[PDB]
């Protein structure tokens, strides 16, 4: 009964803190969208834009805004088909490489925090030269270095 | 808490804290905090939901403002005969009781979907304080634990 | 030649904790099984209620 047309495994979603928008039919997807606000102060938007348009129209990420606040994201060249534009705050992009194989592009980004609350949700608009996406996204802290951070009495 | 996680929380009054910037190594808060941990109706389970699951939630009448973003808090004591409902299924959003296999929908205000439980899990209203810690905005709106003859509903 | 109740592996009692296969002894399993098979037939009589486990 569990191998049916509705199964538990086939329903499951990515155990990640960000949201996603786009289907099998949509030309441009966004994956793992989340407003990353550090516990020190820095903030930004984490996301991955993915072009999969079969008409081979490139999409340039023109602008990103979070609860109406503009995002600074360093210069990105357009996303051709089966290319990916990765984005995070620079402190977290320094922890991974930028592949020479395939088509991946890392761009740092940052927000001026108006005072978002941890745990909450805010609407995020991606605007491409072809169109637009709107998606709710949770405000969250970035991940830690695994296995180094003990907690203390304070 | 991450975006599909569950913590067991207890009521910690401000007079028993002794951590953070106000920590004193001579303040001995242990026995009162244990008294809080060992109350029968004290345990609550604080669940952070994914965003796309949080926007599928069906609230209960009168309890629409109890959550805080993606944070929901439910009484951990089962409404059947009192076991802790400590098994949060992170993908199905069922809260499962190990004693007699009652299943509660967390995207449906804790309403049972299997087993012998009949009543929904009580929900705790929560919020954050000025210093950025999570507090209980109020008391539960219903009696909690198993049912008795005197309990309405 | 065989363990029967490794109480040390279970830890002291805490109202907030529980285990998966937390069954009673075999001579009581029938009562627990009764509690499992009974459906959620509960009566709500105004200000009163007869629980399902009745």
């Amino acid at each position: 009964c569990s191998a049916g047309q509705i199964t538990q495994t086939s329903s499951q979603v990515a155990a990640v803190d960000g949201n996603q928008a786009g289907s099998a039919n949509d030309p441009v997807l966004v994956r793992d969208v989340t407003v990353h606000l550090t516990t020190d102060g820095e903030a930004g938007v984490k996301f991955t834009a993915i072009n999969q348009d079969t008409s081979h129209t490139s999409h340039t990420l023109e602008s990103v805004t979070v609860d109406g606040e503009e995002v600074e994201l360093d210069d990105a060249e357009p996303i051709e088909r089966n290319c990916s534009l990765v984005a995070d705050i620079q402190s977290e992009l320094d922890l991974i490489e930028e592949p020479e194989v395939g088509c991946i592009q890392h761009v740092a980004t940052s927000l001026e925090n108006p005072g978002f609350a941890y745990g909450g949700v805010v609407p995020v608009e991606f605007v491409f030269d072809t169109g637009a996406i709107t998606i709710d996204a949770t405000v969250s802290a970035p991940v830690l270095e695994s296995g180094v951070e003990n907690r203390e009495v304070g | 808490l991450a975006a599909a996680s569950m913590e067991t929380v207890f009521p910690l009054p401000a007079e028993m804290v002794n951590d953070g910037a106000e920590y004193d190594p001579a303040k001995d808060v242990y026995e009162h905090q244990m008294h809080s941990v060992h109350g029968p109706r004290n345990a609550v389970m604080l669940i952070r939901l994914r965003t796309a699951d949080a926007e599928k939630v069906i609230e209960r009448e009168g309890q629409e403002s109890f959550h805080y973003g993606d944070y929901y808090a439910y009484s951990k004591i089962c409404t059947h005969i009192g076991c802790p409902t400590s098994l949060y299924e992170a993908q199905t959003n069922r809260i499962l009781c190990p004693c007699h296999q009652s299943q509660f929908d967390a995207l449906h205000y804790g309403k049972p979907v299997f087993g012998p439980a009949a009543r929904a899990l009580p929900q705790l209203p929560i919020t954050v304080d000025e210093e950025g810690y999570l507090i209980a905005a109020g008391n539960f709106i219903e009696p909690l634990g198993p049912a008795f003859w005197e309990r309405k509903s | 030649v065989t363990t029967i109740n490794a109480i040390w592996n279970l830890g002291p009692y805490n109202p907030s904790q529980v285990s998966a296969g937390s069954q009673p002894d075999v001579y009581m399993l029938w009562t627990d099984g009764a509690a499992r098979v009974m459906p959620a037939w509960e009566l709500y009589l105004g200000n009163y209620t007869i629980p399902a486990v009745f």
Binding site: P114, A117 | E61, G62 | -
Partner: peptide
């Protein structure tokens, strides 16, 4: 045979928004 105080909320969740005050 159902609890008479366990209804669905008539009003739908409005996708509200949170914030915190700050020194700057």
């Amino acid at each position: 045979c159902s609890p008479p105080h366990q209804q669905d909320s008539p009003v739908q969740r409005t996708n509200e928004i949170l914030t915190t005050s700050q020194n700057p």
